[PDB]
Design a protein around this ligand. Structure first.
Ligand SMILES: Nc1ncnc2c1ncn2[C@@H]1O[C@H](COP(=O)(O)OP(=O)(O)OC[C@@H](O)[C@@H](O)C(=O)CO)[C@@H](O)[C@H]1O
Ligand SMILES: Nc1ncnc2c1ncn2[C@@H]1O[C@H](COP(=O)(O)OP(=O)(O)OC[C@@H](O)[C@@H](O)C(=O)CO)[C@@H](O)[C@H]1O
Ligand SMILES: Nc1ncnc2c1ncn2[C@@H]1O[C@H](COP(=O)(O)OP(=O)(O)OC[C@@H](O)[C@@H](O)C(=O)CO)[C@@H](O)[C@H]1O
Ligand SMILES: Nc1ncnc2c1ncn2[C@@H]1O[C@H](COP(=O)(O)OP(=O)(O)OC[C@@H](O)[C@@H](O)C(=O)CO)[C@@H](O)[C@H]1O
Ligand SMILES: Nc1ncnc2c1ncn2[C@@H]1O[C@H](COP(=O)(O)OP(=O)(O)OC[C@@H](O)[C@@H](O)C(=O)CO)[C@@H](O)[C@H]1O
Ligand SMILES: Nc1ncnc2c1ncn2[C@@H]1O[C@H](COP(=O)(O)OP(=O)(O)OC[C@@H](O)[C@@H](O)C(=O)CO)[C@@H](O)[C@H]1O
Lengths: 255, 260, 256, 262, 262, 256
């Protein structure tokens, strides 16, 4: 095989493509912060509904804290009936009894990401949300920068993405909600997660998945961190449901 | 039934035991395999796809917690990678959307690619283990007999802890420009041979050498992707991946032949 | 000598045994956090009593802050009558007068660990307790991860060990009691150790060794740190007695 | 016969501090001359130390880390069991270590139990173990190696420029694992024409069996055992199987006993 | 006599090692009880130490770094001179330090000469200086402060979990500079209802004069001098001018002498 | 007491005096690199002889590796007859027998430094020698920078000090001799110190203290490092004698 490869043609193709993408993407319907299990589920459902969705993830790879499974052991758990949310995306499960299923902790994030992308959602990695955009209305988008710039420690201004809604799906950090409260000196505490009580934790998640400030929703562990809910460890049924519920709430508000 | 109105039954011990139990059946099974591929990059995952379709038992080992290698960042952070005719079929094959940029050049979302390559590999039967470092090789008189493994966490943490092993009929170095498995072989076993490393950039010379350079370099040890060019002093090509995909496929064909 | 050694047989033996240990260990009667002198003493006494005991230690080696003795000088001190707690485990002592004895600071942790293990206690090193498990009842176990993962800085979920009781034997850090208070936003301060007053410190230890929250006990310096007690330096009599007392208190609560 | 909570304990800062000083001071003045210095409190070094001390020699084991044990604790990739094969399993049994039979002459042992019990055996046999102590160099005479140059691990980690002290000995043993760090010091600093090749890749059988052949006096008064032996002679490695380590240590003690009773 | 090159020197490892060990132990066993402990071998602490030792007290100065001197060496922003103003210049002259007159009662001195000569004066007056030694805590009695809890700088930097030793004293002096680290320990660990405010911004005149007022016993048996005094009382700072530092140290010695001859 | 202290007057005095020192110091007779025991002894003797001497030291404090004594134990050893080199500077010694004396490891560097400074030598600390100055003649001085700049990792050009002679007294590093050889691609190896043999080591020091390249002398451990000599540990007699000898050799070469 003769392959025709040229530096300039390669460079320009990347540049050209990246530009059409960037100019288009800086206005969107929904921005999801965090490409974890809850954020990617939310993204799936919103995109199926025809919304223009961007998922932003600080690390170069999506996935959040799924890859390592439980203490390095590469399986994660899902309980009935949230297992359907995995089946529905082609993820193979193993039945371990009593409504408990496991899945390869590398297979899960891959297939959740593909579902999201194939549903229409855009995922940008290597991108840090450092702040929010505000209007009198409430939250109006996100202020973004490059992970590389952040790690490198450089003093460089950001860019923006305007959106109708922002979703904090950043895990136990609840880092977008914290930014809102700290920088805008709101009289409210983000308490953070309590200790482990899997049952209390999993069930609180759905109650705690809501709009916490105008145009700002939380899902996944960010929801329990924001409302002082218990944690559940390497069981993900509530994560997936929270993401879906979050998409339903947003769909309602936005139609 | 309403999604707000769901009772979830979640228990710490049941969760912990399920993960332990499943990890064990996996581990006890996986430590003997037909082929071990080192590196979950574009070449290694392509190779894994083809070998698994052929019914071989394949393990891909990757140091980082996420697969993908150096695809995610695309070109200098700009999140698209290039593929040239006819290697674009190797992407289409796997559901990856391409944009035609002219002259047989296509781009693809640099996040979409590694995801879809990984899914293909896994759906073809290949097992991918991340967070796992190959620190050494296993030898027999025959030649290479498998890999010596440890955890990334242990490595980063700097702890002095012994490894485990995976025996295989074949090992593939798909570790990129590092060519780290070939280097280990040469350095530790004091072989009279130099791993020269990649030359400077000449995309055309580089892309075409890749296929010539994708071969068995020592008994039971194959190289593909940039590891092939690094091992043979070939030029590099930058963020164009047609040769990577073809190298991976070729590497699978060579191994299939040897192993049938 | 011809030795028959094989990679796969070696690997599978390790995996098989570990896998068996793990499935069994994630439910236990008592979890002791910290393989220091107090935690290992507690572990000895509870295991003699037939309880199923796991000691968890973040570092790969047990021992806590015994090894370096005093400012690097490799001897630690024990005072009458706590010296019996060392002799009973085979530790050689040197009489320095006035009811003071010293012991080789390397010999001590080794022999405390052996006693615990031989009494039935299991010691897992390289393991960090990052959180607690709760029920309405009170503390229900511990949330664990690997030291390697922690040092490496990786974002990886934990596993669990359920237990009837948890013991904070983590030294002056009192890190388990702190986790409880901080994360569950309890209205209470963990004051931390006061300055050195060896006599006040040694004697307070026994008063301070107790159940501080349902199913959570403290012993060793964690006890004084939790109750704002004085410290005593490289003298360990109270540490050993605290561990023993802590085992007695737990035995009482748990035998039924 | 009382509530433990009531016991009156007499504890005093000065008495505590002086007891530690006094005892360390006696220990140090005595220890700086010895028959054998073993560098590395790993499985091979501690085994060696057991056997030499039983024989009545004055033995010091030096270990850089605060805890003894070497790379035993983490077992295999974190999984806390190590393997031993027939007949080296007796070297564990004899020290009270419980073994589980896994078949085909393979036994496992709790990776935390092993180093503890090896250390206790050594100490109870008479050996002295000093942790937190780095060997940074050797002492020489025309005769050959004459002891070790020592410093504190704390000082080393802290990066401070501080002179060392010494321990004179008739023999030195490099039991420092794959580093073979004492042999390397000898060669590098004294510009000897010889290469320390380092370990080859894994071949457990070739590796385990070479260990016994490779356990020897490599330079006058300097022995190697454990992985240091295979590293020094370009031998293969064997992973988390320790039968050869234990035998190497024992063999090393036999070779030294022979040389020194002469 | 001869060309130096031909001198026969008798040097032996063991004799060297045992001499150091022997002398250190006599020193350590003696030093762990003292009249006064000064924390910080800076300009104020070393001055204080001079005056207390001249008075016949048994004084130990403890310094974390291997070298004494505090923040004198670098002078002002690296420029190696420090300033002293009339009449505190006599406190330098009296110790042999050469001064250059810059006018208006301002003198400079070589920033390397000063710490050296202050240290020599202290040592020659009888004071003992131990470097490489960190004070991590205080010793208490109902009476008040009863000494210091000490550890090795090496151990601290290395990050090791190792217990300390102690030095009992009638008085402790915090001469640790703007950190006021001993006073802070007292307050933080013993949960005293009092704030250590720390130094204010620069106002050299207000700062220099407050120092003498602020040099006092702040808790029973605990004195402050030097910048620790201003840090403890929220006083202004003065920069690279040291007259008040020297006077503070001297005043501190006078206050202590008074208390202790009672 | 009313003290008159002013920021500007303070700042200007420091600046004024420093600039005067700097403009004068950048030409000197002898530059000694390393304020250790050998370098400071050499400096004493050269300055007594009327030469203009600068000692340069990277760390903010002088002293080299004296302060910590032996493995932290704060005493260093000196053997007959080199003990006179310490008594002559006011250092108190303790007789430990057989011609061995010890001295407080903090007292020694202080008093060596004072002697040097009082003899006329200038000591500049916080100053790194990063390179040499050359002429056809041979070595012509040193290229200097600030320790702070080096540690901070900043890319900043240096300044210079011209001298008739340069002395490498940088200890076992022998860092100035190494710079010469590496950067100027001389066909010669700096072997570095051998292992410990105190007697061989101490005696070789005097033979090894010499001019190794035109205008470049070595003393102290740098001498043994340069010539592959054995080391001797915390015994300093040879260090002191090496420094003195080095001053004698330089005096001879330089008096005319
Ligand atoms: N400011 C930010 N900008 C961009 N990405 C961010 C930012 N902050 C966090 N992230 C990224 O957001 C993602 C969060 O994924 P993560 O997986 O932590 O969130 P989740 O979807 O709620 O699931 C939590 C579970 O993994 C597990 O912990 C659990 O069940 C609790 O016991 C991760 O991939 C982060 O790197
Ligand atoms: N010892 C090891 N153990 C496990 N994984 C390893 C080891 N060494 C390397 N890897 C892993 O190997 C993976 C794949 O590497 P990588 O993605 O570099 O290899 P590739 O498939 O040939 O692709 C090369 C292109 O990305 C690009 O560079 C190019 O076109 C040349 O100009 C990366 O994800 C590494 O983390
Ligand atoms: N979160 C955690 N998970 C696991 N291990 C932990 C955790 N936190 C601490 N540890 C481990 O707990 C152990 C504490 O042992 P440590 O020896 O500090 O505790 P102790 O038994 O009360 O004895 C204290 C004395 O050493 C000394 O301080 C004294 O006499 C007072 O002046 C050490 O070995 C830690 O590594
Ligand atoms: N210069 C030094 N001074 C003091 N201790 C030292 C020095 N250099 C190394 N050590 C210490 O020496 C000890 C060596 O113990 P290590 O366990 O490495 O040596 P070993 O006895 O031969 O056993 C090797 C096995 O762990 C395993 O790896 C195997 O079977 C091969 O695949 C460790 O505890 C080091 O910290
Ligand atoms: N816990 C501790 N243990 C031992 N030494 C300590 C401790 N904490 C601090 N030190 C040491 O104490 C010494 C304090 O010396 P320092 O020089 O800081 O104190 P000073 O005597 O008041 O003089 C201050 C002036 O240098 C100057 O800055 C000024 O005029 C204000 O603008 C320094 O050498 C520290 O390293
Ligand atoms: N490039 C440089 N620029 C400036 N200073 C330097 C440079 N390189 C080294 N130094 C400084 O030079 C000084 C060397 O003093 P050092 O004390 O190492 O040298 P010495 O005077 O020969 O005495 C050696 C003994 O301490 C010890 O080694 C021994 O007897 C064991 O065999 C130290 O104070 C360094 O900081």
């Amino acid at each position: 095989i003769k392959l025709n490869a040229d530096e300039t043609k390669t460079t320009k193709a990347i540049l050209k493509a990246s530009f059409d993408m960037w100019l288009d993407i800086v206005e969107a319907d929904v921005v999801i912060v965090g490409a974890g299990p809850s954020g990617l589920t939310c993204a799936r459902y919103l995109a199926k509904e025809g919304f223009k969705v961007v998922v932003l993830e600080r690390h170069l790879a999506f996935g959040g804290g799924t890859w390592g499974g439980g203490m390095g052991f590469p399986y994660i758990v899902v309980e009935e009936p949230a297992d359907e949310l995995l089946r529905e995306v082609g993820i193979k499960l193993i039945d371990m009894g009593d409504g408990y299923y496991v899945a390869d902790s590398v297979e899960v994030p891959a297939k959740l990401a593909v579902a999201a992308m194939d549903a229409g959602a855009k995922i940008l990695t290597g991108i840090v949300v450092e702040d929010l955009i505000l209007r009198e209305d409430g939250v109006a988008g996100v202020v973004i920068n490059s992970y590389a710039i952040e790690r490198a420690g450089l003093h460089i201004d950001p860019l923006t993405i305007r959106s109708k809604v922002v979703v904090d799906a950043t895990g136990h950090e609840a880092s977008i909600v914290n930014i809102l409260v700290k920088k805008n000196k709101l009289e409210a505490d983000v308490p953070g997660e309590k200790s482990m009580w899997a049952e209390k934790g999993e069930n609180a998640l759905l109650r705690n998945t809501r709009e916490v400030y105008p145009n700002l929703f939380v899902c996944g562990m960010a929801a329990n961190a924001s409302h002082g809910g218990y944690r559940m460890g390497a069981i993900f049924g509530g994560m997936y449901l929270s993401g879906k519920l979050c998409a339903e709430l947003i769909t309602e508000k936005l139609k």
